[PDB]
Amino acid sequence: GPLGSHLVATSESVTEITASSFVVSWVSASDTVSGFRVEYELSEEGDEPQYLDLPSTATSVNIPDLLPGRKYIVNVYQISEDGEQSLILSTSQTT
C-alpha cells in the first residue's frame, strides 16, 4: 500500500553530507533541454552565487564545498537548444 509514503526513501535522502554537501534531483521538465544549470547561494550572507552546468541527461547533482550551519537557496534551470533557461525546481536547505 502507500506505506503512507514510507518516506520509503530512507537514507537521509541527503547523503553527501561531507562539507555539508547537498544532493538535489529534479525532472528534465523538457526533452529539448541542451543542459542544466544549478545555482546556489547563501540565503543569509547573500554571498556570490555559484553555477554548475550539467548535460541535458543529468537530473541530479551534488553541491560540495557547502558551509555547515548555513542556509542555501537552490534553483535548477534547464537550458534549451536556444540557450533559454527555465526554472524547473527551486528549494532551500539548511546544512
Swiss-Prot record:
Source organism superkingdom: Eukaryota
Domain Fibronectin type-III: from-to ranges: 8-95
Name this protein carries in UniProt: Ugl-Y2
Gene, per the UniProt record: FN1
